[PDB]
């Protein structure tokens, strides 16, 4: 890698970048590319998992919290539960009763409730000083090797590229994690590019790269308070304390007209691969929340937004508000048995992201649904 505190993506296992990277245009070179067989994708996926796992090693396990919780809703609303439980203190012969708020999605019923992963694995809390904000990562070639770049403006992903340049290394790629919509990536320069391994299959996803960004404004309106609970000898647990003010739902705002222009353009270019059929967009069909919603890390909180307000239309020859849920116990990269607890972040959260692309899947009139939780399709 090459790069340019304690960020989760900056473990410093890799060197600093060259301030003035070179690029050499190779005249008269035709090179056959195939983005679906590219092994830089597997390399990135593996490195991303390792940076994450290394970063979570040096911190507190929440094994001691797998106790029965007594959860009520006595003082929150007229999805968030007020739970009491017994914990040990730094002395092994002493216990105390404490209170914390938990989101309903992190707690399951069985002295009424249990944390969702206590019968599966140990939950590690995120190390509290570690930021999850993405840092561009450059991938650079070793001696004896070269990285070739395709400069064709209309290149979809496969076949000959008629403008090939040699680079010392790649542009910085931000390890942004998302599902249905691709955020903060690169834009197409001339038109929306629709690319897939096989545009006529149903088993393959379609990556749609936009040439214009659409802003999405997301927020977490509840003024959460962080509370620090001592679990052990130098081991602190970060709990949500009382909510100050109103209890409000997290949400994302997408302009109505920008989204509609984006779809008119996506459909126009989709009818270039499909015959002149009616095209319909539907919400995803079901399954785990990580698949059915648009997930992202905003300010360090993990959002799961409902996109049925976007993918609900029929195409033939104001502001959109998406409600969102927040979870503290998560299982990234579809790895079962390795949950992580995201400590609450004090204060209100707001972030503005750029939708730069979509991940669509064809159902068995053509039907398209958003989706694909396999991170390699983002990279």
């Amino acid at each position, epitope marked *: 890698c090459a790069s340019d505190k304690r960020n989760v993506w900056a473990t410093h296992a890799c060197v600093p970048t060259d301030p003035n990277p070179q690029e050499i245009v190779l005249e008269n070179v035709t090179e056959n590319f195939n983005m679906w067989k590219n092994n830089m994708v597997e390399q990135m996926h593996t490195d991303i998992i390792s940076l994450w796992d290394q970063s979570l090693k040096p911190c507190v396990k929440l094994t001691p919290l797998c106790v029965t919780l007594n959860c009520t809703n006595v*003082n*929150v*609303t*007229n999805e968030i539960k007020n739970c009491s439980f017994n914990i040990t203190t730094e002395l092994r012969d002493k216990k105390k009763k404490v209170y914390a708020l938990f989101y309903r999605l992190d707690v399951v019923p069985i002295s009424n409730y249990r944390l969702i992963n206590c019968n599966t694995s140990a939950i590690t809390q995120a190390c509290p000083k570690v930021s999850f904000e993405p840092i561009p990562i450059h991938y650079c070639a070793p001696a004896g090797f070269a990285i070739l770049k395709c400069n064709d403006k209309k290149f979809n992903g496969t076949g000959p590229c008629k403008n090939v340049s040699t680079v010392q290394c790649t542009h910085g790629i931000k390890p942004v994690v998302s599902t249905q919509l691709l955020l903060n990536g690169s834009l197409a320069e001339e038109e929306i590019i629709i690319r897939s391994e096989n545009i006529t299959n149903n088993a393959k996803t379609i990556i749609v790269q936009l040439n214009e960004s659409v802003e999405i404004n997301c927020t977490r*309106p509840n003024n959460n308070t962080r509370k620090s609970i001592r679990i052990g000898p130098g081991q602190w647990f970060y709990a949500t304390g009382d909510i*100050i*003010g*109103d*209890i*409000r*739902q997290a*949400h994302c705002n997408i302009s109505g007209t920008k989204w509609n222009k984006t779809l008119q353009q996506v459909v126009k270019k989709l009818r270039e691969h499909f015959n002149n059929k009616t095209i319909i967009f539907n919400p995803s069909s079901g399954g785990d929340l990580e698949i059915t919603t648009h997930s992202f890390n905003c300010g360090g909180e993990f959002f799961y937004c409902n996109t049925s307000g976007l993918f609900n239309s029929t195409w033939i020859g104001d502001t959109i*508000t998406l*409600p969102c849920r927040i979870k503290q116990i998560i299982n990234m990269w579809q790895r079962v048995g390795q949950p992580m607890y995201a400590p609450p972040i004090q204060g209100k959260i707001r972030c503005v992201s750029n939708i730069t692309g979509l991940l669509l899947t064809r159902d068995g009139t053509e039907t398209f649904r958003p989706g694909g939780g396999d991170m390699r399709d983002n990279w």
Partner: antibody
Amino acid sequence: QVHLQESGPGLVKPSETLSLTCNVSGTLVRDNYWSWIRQPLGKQPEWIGYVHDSGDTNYNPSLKSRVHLSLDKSKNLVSLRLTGVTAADSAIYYCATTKHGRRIYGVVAFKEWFTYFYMDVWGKGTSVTVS
Amino acid sequence: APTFVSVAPGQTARITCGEESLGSRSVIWYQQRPGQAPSLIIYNNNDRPSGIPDRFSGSPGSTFGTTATLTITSVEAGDEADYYCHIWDSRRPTNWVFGEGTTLIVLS
């Protein structure tokens, strides 16, 4: 000017039905919300419930099974039927018009708001003793 | 149950109610002359109905952690009345009972 006049028996027996009537003048019953309020002597007033057309009626939970409120459109009267009266019901009762509005704190689409009620026009009331 | 304050005529009175605000609120204030039905002074924290002077105002419903407050400036002999306060709050259940009042005693 709306005028609300009130009457009742004055004296009601224990474990008996109390029926109070509010004579509405200057406005029609069908066009507003009505509330009943009572004030035990020496105490802060209690909101019994409120009644309106379109089924928009609700009651103080402690009186959920004791109070029936109704509106007589033809006689333009507002009334209260309280059953099973006890010593605790020995209060001055009032008839009042009610107005309402909405307090919005968040996204209206997510129903992050509530309806509040207030009483602008009050009658003189009637004193009821349960013996 | 009641609280008392004593203000010389021409002085400002301060009357408060309830518990701390949890969420957005809409406080409704009433004035009760002895022997009479109460009447409305303020609805929605600071919106007074016609007939009520600008001497009556109060705290906003936008804050949390505070109590309802009614401020009566230039108190007159005509303000010797009890004061009641009905609190609506976005996190608490509907309050069917007006809170305990504060009696304003006007001197001289």
